[PDB]
Amino acid sequence: QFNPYGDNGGTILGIAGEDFAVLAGDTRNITDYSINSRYEPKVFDCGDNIVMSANGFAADGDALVKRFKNSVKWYHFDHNDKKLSINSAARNIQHLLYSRRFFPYYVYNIIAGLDEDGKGAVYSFDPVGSYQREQCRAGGAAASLIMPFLDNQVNFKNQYEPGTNGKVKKPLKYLSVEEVIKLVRDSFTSATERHIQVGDGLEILIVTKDGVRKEFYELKRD
Amino acid sequence: MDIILGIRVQDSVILASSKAVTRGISVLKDSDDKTRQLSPHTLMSFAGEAGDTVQFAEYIQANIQLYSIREDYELSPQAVSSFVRQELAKSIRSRRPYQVNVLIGGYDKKKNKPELYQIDYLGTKVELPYGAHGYSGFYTFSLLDHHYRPDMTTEEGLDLLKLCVQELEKRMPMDFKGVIVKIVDKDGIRQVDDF
Amino acid sequence: MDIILGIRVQDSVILASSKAVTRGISVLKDSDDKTRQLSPHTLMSFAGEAGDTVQFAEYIQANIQLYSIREDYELSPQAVSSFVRQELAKSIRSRRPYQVNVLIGGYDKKKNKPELYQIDYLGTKVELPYGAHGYSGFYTFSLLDHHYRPDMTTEEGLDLLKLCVQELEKRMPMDFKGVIVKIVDKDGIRQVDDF
Amino acid sequence: SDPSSINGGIVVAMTGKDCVAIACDLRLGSQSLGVSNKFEKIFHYGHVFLGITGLATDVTTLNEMFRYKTNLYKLKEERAIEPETFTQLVSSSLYERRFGPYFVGPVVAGINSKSGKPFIAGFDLIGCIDEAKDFIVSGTASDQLFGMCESLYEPNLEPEDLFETISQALLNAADRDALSGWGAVVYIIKKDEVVKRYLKMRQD
Amino acid sequence: TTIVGVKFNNGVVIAADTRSTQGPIVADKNCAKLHRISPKIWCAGAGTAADTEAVTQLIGSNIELHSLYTSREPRVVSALQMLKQHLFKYQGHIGAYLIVAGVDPTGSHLFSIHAHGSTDVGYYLSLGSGSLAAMAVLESHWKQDLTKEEAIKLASDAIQAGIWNDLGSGSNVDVCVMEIGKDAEYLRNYLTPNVREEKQKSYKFPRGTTAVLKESIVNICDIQEE
Amino acid sequence: TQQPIVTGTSVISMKYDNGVIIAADNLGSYGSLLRFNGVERLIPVGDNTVVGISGDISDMQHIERLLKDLVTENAYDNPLADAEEALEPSYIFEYLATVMYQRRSKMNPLWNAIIVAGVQSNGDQFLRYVNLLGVTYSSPTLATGFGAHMANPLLRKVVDRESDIPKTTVQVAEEAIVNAMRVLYYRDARSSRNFSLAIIDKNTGLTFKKNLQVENMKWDFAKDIKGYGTQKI
Amino acid sequence: TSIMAVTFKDGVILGADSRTTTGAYIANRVTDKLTRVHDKIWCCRSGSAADTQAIADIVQYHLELYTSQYGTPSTETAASVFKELCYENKDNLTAGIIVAGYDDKNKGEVYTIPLGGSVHKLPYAIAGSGSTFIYGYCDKNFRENMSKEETVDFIKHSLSQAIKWDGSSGGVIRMVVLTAAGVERLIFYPDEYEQL
Amino acid sequence: TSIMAVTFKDGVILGADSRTTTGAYIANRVTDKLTRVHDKIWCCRSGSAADTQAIADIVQYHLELYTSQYGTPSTETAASVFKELCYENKDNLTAGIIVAGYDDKNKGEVYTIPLGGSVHKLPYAIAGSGSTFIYGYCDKNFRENMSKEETVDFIKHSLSQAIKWDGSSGGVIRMVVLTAAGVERLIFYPDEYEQL
Amino acid sequence: TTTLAFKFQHGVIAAVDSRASAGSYISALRMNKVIEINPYLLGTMSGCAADCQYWERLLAKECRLYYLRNGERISVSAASKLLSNMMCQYRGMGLSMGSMICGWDKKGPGLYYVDEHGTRLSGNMFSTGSGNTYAYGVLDSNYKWDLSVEDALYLGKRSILAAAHRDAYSGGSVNLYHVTEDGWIYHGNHDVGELFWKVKEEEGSFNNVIG
Ligand SMILES: *[C@@](C)(CO)[C@](*)(O)[C@H](Cc1ccccc1)NC(=O)[C@H](Cc1ccc(OC)cc1)NC(=O)[C@@H](C)NC(=O)C1=CC2=CCC=CC2=C1C
Ligand SMILES: [Mg+2]
Ligand SMILES: [Mg+2]
Ligand SMILES: [Mg+2]
Numbered sequence A: 001q002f003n004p005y006g007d008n009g010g011t012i013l014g015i016a017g018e019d020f021a022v023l024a025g026d027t028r029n030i031t032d033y034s035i036n037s038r039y040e041p042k043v044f045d046c047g048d049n050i051v052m053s054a055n056g057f058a059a060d061g062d063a064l065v066k067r068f069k070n071s072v073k074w075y076h077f078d079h080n081d082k083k084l085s086i087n088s089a090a091r092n093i094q095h096l097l098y099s100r101r102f103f104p105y106y107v108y109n110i111i112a113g114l115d116e117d118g119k120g121a122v123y124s125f126d127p128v129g130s131y132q133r134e135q136c137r138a139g140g141a142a143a144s145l146i147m148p149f150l151d152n153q154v155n156f157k158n159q160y161e162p163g164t165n166g167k168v169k170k171p172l173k174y175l176s177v178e179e180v181i182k183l184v185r186d187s188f189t190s191a192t193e194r195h196i197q198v199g200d201g202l203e204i205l206i207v208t209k210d211g212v213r214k215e216f217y218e219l220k221r222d
Numbered sequence B, C: 001m002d003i004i005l006g007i008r009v010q011d012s013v014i015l016a017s018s019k020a021v022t023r024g025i026s027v028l029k030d031s032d033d034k035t036r037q038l039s040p041h042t043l044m045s046f047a048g049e050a051g052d053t054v055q056f057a058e059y060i061q062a063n064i065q066l067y068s069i070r071e072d073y074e075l076s077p078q079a080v081s082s083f084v085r086q087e088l089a090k091s092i093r094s095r096r097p098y099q100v101n102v103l104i105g106g107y108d109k110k111k112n113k114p115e116l117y118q119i120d121y122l123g124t125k126v127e128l129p130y131g132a133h134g135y136s137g138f139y140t141f142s143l144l145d146h147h148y149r150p151d152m153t154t155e156e157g158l159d160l161l162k163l164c165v166q167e168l169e170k171r172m173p174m175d176f177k178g179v180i181v182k183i184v185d186k187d188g189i190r191q192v193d194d195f
Numbered sequence D: 001s002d003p004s005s006i007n008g009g010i011v012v013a014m015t016g017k018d019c020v021a022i023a024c025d026l027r028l029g030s031q032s033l034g035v036s037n038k039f040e041k042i043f044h045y046g047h048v049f050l051g052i053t054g055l056a057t058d059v060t061t062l063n064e065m066f067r068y069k070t071n072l073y074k075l076k077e078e079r080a081i082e083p084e085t086f087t088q089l090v091s092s093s094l095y096e097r098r099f100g101p102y103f104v105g106p107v108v109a110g111i112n113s114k115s116g117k118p119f120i121a122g123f124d125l126i127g128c129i130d131e132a133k134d135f136i137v138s139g140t141a142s143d144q145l146f147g148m149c150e151s152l153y154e155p156n157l158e159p160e161d162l163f164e165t166i167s168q169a170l171l172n173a174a175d176r177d178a179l180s181g182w183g184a185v186v187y188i189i190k191k192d193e194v195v196k197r198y199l200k201m202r203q204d
Numbered sequence E: 001t002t003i004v005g006v007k008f009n010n011g012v013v014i015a016a017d018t019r020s021t022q023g024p025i026v027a028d029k030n031c032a033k034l035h036r037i038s039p040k041i042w043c044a045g046a047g048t049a050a051d052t053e054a055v056t057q058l059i060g061s062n063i064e065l066h067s068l069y070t071s072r073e074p075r076v077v078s079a080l081q082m083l084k085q086h087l088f089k090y091q092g093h094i095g096a097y098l099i100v101a102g103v104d105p106t107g108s109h110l111f112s113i114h115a116h117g118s119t120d121v122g123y124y125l126s127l128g129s130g131s132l133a134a135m136a137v138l139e140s141h142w143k144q145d146l147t148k149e150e151a152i153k154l155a156s157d158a159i160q161a162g163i164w165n166d167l168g169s170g171s172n173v174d175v176c177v178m179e180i181g182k183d184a185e186y187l188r189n190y191l192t193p194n195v196r197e198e199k200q201k202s203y204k205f206p207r208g209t210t211a212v213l214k215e216s217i218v219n220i221c222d223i224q225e226e
Numbered sequence F: 001t002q003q004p005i006v007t008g009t010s011v012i013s014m015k016y017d018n019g020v021i022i023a024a025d026n027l028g029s030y031g032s033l034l035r036f037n038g039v040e041r042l043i044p045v046g047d048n049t050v051v052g053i054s055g056d057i058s059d060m061q062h063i064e065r066l067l068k069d070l071v072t073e074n075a076y077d078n079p080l081a082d083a084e085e086a087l088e089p090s091y092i093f094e095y096l097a098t099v100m101y102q103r104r105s106k107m108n109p110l111w112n113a114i115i116v117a118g119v120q121s122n123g124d125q126f127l128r129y130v131n132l133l134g135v136t137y138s139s140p141t142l143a144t145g146f147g148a149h150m151a152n153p154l155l156r157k158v159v160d161r162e163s164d165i166p167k168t169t170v171q172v173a174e175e176a177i178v179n180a181m182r183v184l185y186y187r188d189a190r191s192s193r194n195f196s197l198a199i200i201d202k203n204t205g206l207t208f209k210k211n212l213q214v215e216n217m218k219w220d221f222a223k224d225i226k227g228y229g230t231q232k233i
Numbered sequence G, H: 001t002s003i004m005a006v007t008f009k010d011g012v013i014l015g016a017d018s019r020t021t022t023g024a025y026i027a028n029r030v031t032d033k034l035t036r037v038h039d040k041i042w043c044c045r046s047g048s049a050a051d052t053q054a055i056a057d058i059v060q061y062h063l064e065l066y067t068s069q070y071g072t073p074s075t076e077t078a079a080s081v082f083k084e085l086c087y088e089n090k091d092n093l094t095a096g097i098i099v100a101g102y103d104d105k106n107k108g109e110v111y112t113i114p115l116g117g118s119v120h121k122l123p124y125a126i127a128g129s130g131s132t133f134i135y136g137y138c139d140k141n142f143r144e145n146m147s148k149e150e151t152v153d154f155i156k157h158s159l160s161q162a163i164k165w166d167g168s169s170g171g172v173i174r175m176v177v178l179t180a181a182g183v184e185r186l187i188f189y190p191d192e193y194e195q196l
Numbered sequence I: 001t002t003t004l005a006f007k008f009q010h011g012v013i014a015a016v017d018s019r020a021s022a023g024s025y026i027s028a029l030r031m032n033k034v035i036e037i038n039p040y041l042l043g044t045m046s047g048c049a050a051d052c053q054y055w056e057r058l059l060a061k062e063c064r065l066y067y068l069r070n071g072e073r074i075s076v077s078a079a080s081k082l083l084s085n086m087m088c089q090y091r092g093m094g095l096s097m098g099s100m101i102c103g104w105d106k107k108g109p110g111l112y113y114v115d116e117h118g119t120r121l122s123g124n125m126f127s128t129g130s131g132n133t134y135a136y137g138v139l140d141s142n143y144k145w146d147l148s149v150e151d152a153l154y155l156g157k158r159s160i161l162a163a164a165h166r167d168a169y170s171g172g173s174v175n176l177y178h179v180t181e182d183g184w185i186y187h188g189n190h191d192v193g194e195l196f197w198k199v200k201e202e203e204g205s206f207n208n209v210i211g
């Protein structure tokens, strides 16, 4: 019997700063125990200072991104070159996903950018369209490995201030872009060690008021 | 839903229907009224799959109310029961059938007679002196076979009905949270608030 | 069978067990005692598959009674609970396992303390202040979590138990025909005849 | 249905400088229902510690079994069993039920009394040994623990530092698992002193 | 798992990777897949890991007792025959897939054995999920009359092919060389091409970060005198 | 939903400094039966693209016709059909990828795995894969079926990453491809000795080699192998 | 697999390919499918390699013990031991074996033992997945009392076609000649037989 | 079923057996499996008789209409119509058809269309359940540019072996000769071909 | 999930948890399970997160169009029925959505339960989700019509806490809402971890748990 779905592996990671946002993902593409490509980009600049990644089944992920990029194009045509806000893009994507409620896009989608007040924003989706704005989110194969680390190192969960003994929490100080990129690299380096589908390369897209910037880092190829 | 009973006495029809509604392992409501007035002298109780029951009943209600306005005339219980049967017989061969069993209690003002019709989800109609759906009849029909007379009063009908509910409450494993009882006679439809 | 509850208070253990027994669609009995005295200060309630429950309980009872005669000494509730667990853990990997869940309520005369053990059919033992099997805990544990104190009297334990049964009677779909309540303390085992 | 995930639970062990640590959650459940918040999964036979995750009846059963076997070992050998030897006993005992296994994920932790060398090890339900230097994980949040341990761990940590590292690995892994939590315990083990600490965590 | 066996002039060599997995997760990054049956007979296994160990230790135990009984050094055909008859009896339920190699008074030997009890003979073999990647290298570079140094190179190159191209294989390369008239040399971590890079940050916590409820001393010592 | 009947095995390819190479054997299997021995599975599109196909042969012949029709249609009302507005490898690939993903979304797939190899207008190398699921990826080396497991490891020793491409000559790349085809003949039970090879170079254009054979095979060592363990004779 | 055994004037010859597959992967391309159970009694194996190896090992044991007590066994006797194993354990076995041997009294004999455990004595026999493709060729070209060189050519040509059409067959062609002179092993490589 | 079509110097010959089975019962022992879609374009049918008859009837309709408009169609054109039906309806069909025809320009041509709906032009083709047994024989004995009498003997001998080993094949051997001279039907009975 | 809602003297309380699950994995710690359809209408969510978000936001579109056509706010009864009719179109197609429609209209405060089967029930008190049994236990024993706003908010808060504790697939935080005739009022996000320890000390409950 024909199975229309597949699993191309990979893992993605979105973190929102005070005035910036990052969206990272490994560059490895796989089927079963074989490697298809060591460098197959997964995170895209979709225009209007928005970045997107659809992780899971690559064919569905490429179709969704392709459709959203198209949605952005037609938003400019129909509404006098108005900028598509990150919250408006998120809602639009919900409707793209739910159009296939009975034959789903087999992907975990994340977008990142800036909100209308200039603050960093990350939106996260499930395969059928439920979405929500978040501060921190890992998606894909090694999502369960990375998310607890982010709960601990980004939102300072289970961390208290010494001397008080559990009476006073660690305060929620914001993170710089340099500190975030460290957490991203360490997240993927750790995921590469313990997950077989993760490795080869890491591509990070950083979003600021100045635009979209890229950074690439090698990973273990085993 | 679970249990719906019906009995036709001398000058009225009495319908008793359980109050329980269950989702999962929790009883969400213990005061549910499993019935709709189709016309001033015609009442329909119902039981079957979740959701389908109310949708079907309200759909029938709308059609009979439409007929009443168009002709300025109340259809006989027999005519209503035939209309309902056809809708169920039409439904059973559909893509997704409506899984609903009904009792139709009415008073025919022309003939001055009470009438009780039992119709299952397949479209199986029978006129009866007393009736039930599902497992309800397994416990109650022996009592009704014994005690029922056609010249019974409404009060005697209620007493025989109490005996049926007591037997159900003793020997059924399920808790159906008692019953709402309604009487259909020449003066119309009324609810027995204490039972 | 259906519902068995247990609660350990200051100076006693209280076990409540349903009275219903059902075959097919008929409730055959509404006064069944789902318990066996293992020793003068140790009581075991049980619930599970038909037939297996009583056979297992009586088999355990015989073994403990044999120990008591041989040594002229009552085993501690902890020792009895461990013996029972091993028998169930032995049973789960047999050709045909015994599908029985139990609560063991006992008063340790050496330590002068009440003790309640919950053991499921797999051989999963836990000592608890209050316990239940099957779906019973889903309805009752929220009340027990709220109201329970370790210094409660036997009378306060019974009042909290009444509240648990009332909640079960309201939100459970099944009619379990009330409960038989038994108290285990320093003076032995006695039944609460009015509940 | 899956025996390894009915009751829930987790265990993690770490090595440090002249020390080891082993920790576990306290939950016992029947799938979605939480039953006990006092179900400890770590046992010790002399100075050798054993944590067991999986089906609770088999956890209890195996503890009683290794207590049985280590008590006889001691009577005959006239000395307490060592971690390396115990590890082989666990492996042997599990494989003898190859086609009717105990649904468990054991973890051994201890310090050799003669060499003073810290030791940890893990197994699958059937006996395969995993002798890792750094850390061992087991349970329903094993994936979560792997991610935390791999990123937080560094070699040659002192006892009081190792405590913080293992505690945070467990706590944050348990908070991303529905079937783990409801309390936690951490053993810090040195050659001739052992401390046991109960952690404060969210009770949901 | 990637595992190979290569014959040469005066003996035989086997090699393996060092990754063990539980599905897509790596449990051990430095597993030892090269097992010893007797001093000069080494095997290496793929499939169910517990089975490959248990069956290796069992036959190794019986081989040692046999060697003592006969006052002779153990032969590879004995280990082979004992293994296949054991595996055949359990009709594939013992998931042990092995490459067996060694030297004895008869000479140098190289066999493969599958879980159902079938055995094969060869000059070069490969087993595991990375067997195809390794065999591609062996079929490209293997030749007759190899030297010891050429065979170790071919063996480790074959393992590397599996490490890089198969997700079930990774980390390091273990080797064991069995030459005639010599002691067998076990080269644990012969290659180390997958060292984790330094982390960007230290995650060592401030002491007191974790909240605590109760502390207590654990009595591990026996009952005391006086 | 269907099942493949007459099938073609591995298609392998790689990039080199001035272009791309692609190869595939000439066999059409009918299960275990080696039924058809003269099947061409490399299909040129113009003088700048070669499409290599594995999987169901009836679906291959269908695709072969779509491409032939694509060339015809591109020439319609196009004075620059043999120049600026000629078909590019990227155009041909995206068309096929669109078709493959549409067919899988109707649960009626083309049971194939395709590699499009070519050279673009600006001289850039093009090498991309697509299959029955609509899954696409690109890499310095690409291979289908068994070639993915056995050929890629050998070709990745020549071009392990992007920076190795300018260092790789056509002689080295062709040598690696030919060796890979021999290895597949040793080890793939649904392969044949006869195969076709195509080179698309940015300077020398399209070279299409037919009726190639696997040669320099090693079998002599078989004489020494006796029994399955204990047998000496 | 493609296996055959053919009787001729001076004795009998066994022949086989050398391919072993696990699905479409060739696990071994130089397999020896011609196995010895006694000095001049050999068998060709088809089906489960585990089953056929286990059987042939047990048969070799029985004939070694037979020889110790009663002297050199007949080819019929060897085929009977194979049969007794294949028939009584038919529910747990997948083995198709051809037995061939030489006596001075009975000369060359061939017995085939298919899946069920039946025995059939024949002038020549073919078996394996590749045998289906050469039923017509072998029937048309076989003759009784051929010479050694004629019989070698017959087996070579036959297996060449089996290999040509069957993907489960291939590699080299191995042969074993059983005569009064002794036991001769032969081998024929692809470049020789493919061009026939 | 055993069917084949062979090209030779003067044109092409189609050949077939005459057995139709429903399990082990022979529903028809004198079936005509050689069917005409045009004057000098014939086909051999294998698979579901209902499917192959329905297809050949539709093809005959298309070529009759083609001829009315555009003149005599090529054998390639006929094979394309078969293909288009067999390929587009592959999910609901079980048909294996061999197409054979004669032009004065292209002379004798043979196309085979197996289950999937692929097309393969060949010098000769074999198909049906009995074809498996003669792959080796036909490969060894076929030559290009044979005479009529040589080609008749080749088909006769080939199908004789197919019938001999395949229980689903049997009866008489029917043949159709397609040349410039015209269309010749042949028939060969068991007593003739069995003793070959 | 665990959700609840009940009518009382001073309007209607609505309380939900914030957990989301993907097997045993907790995919979200803080998810919003209430939708503000309009200033006098709320909607709880239980089941498939996608289904709950899509259909309740589609309900809000349709309730807004009602206001424009009629120049008047939609009733709670009519809003619940529109939603139940949406569910009846996709009857048996595999949707999973359990919701309470809470609000205040001309008839006073209104509360309707609606599920994927098309069920539509009017009532004073409801609770949906995997932990509804635990919440019902607290509600049934402590509910009155004569509840003060302060005591009512605490009841819904405490009832979710009970479920978050016992049910493995309920927890994270508690979101509170109070519906009045001037509209709904959000009464904050309450972390269960912190709330548990607080309630334990102040109330004396959860005696079995150590802290
Ligand atoms: C309890 C947690 C029950 O498990 C609740 O019912 C909760 C309700 C709810 C959550 C969020 C928003 C609205 C309502 N339900 C779930 O979490 C739900 C459980 C579930 C799973 C599968 C089915 O199919 C029959 C029904 C119900 N879980 C989900 O819907 C899962 C699929 N959601 C996610 O995994 C998920 C991941 C994610 C990432 C980013 C943003 C949203 C995400 C979601 C919803
Ligand atoms: Mg690898
Ligand atoms: Mg009826
Ligand atoms: Mg919880």
Ligand SMILES: [Mg+2]
Residues within 6 Å of the ligand: G163, G164, G165, G166, G167, G168, G169, G170
């Ligand atoms: Mg072949």
Ligand SMILES: [Mg+2]
Residues within 6 Å of the ligand: H163, H164, H165, H166, H167, H168, H169, H170
């Ligand atoms: Mg015949």
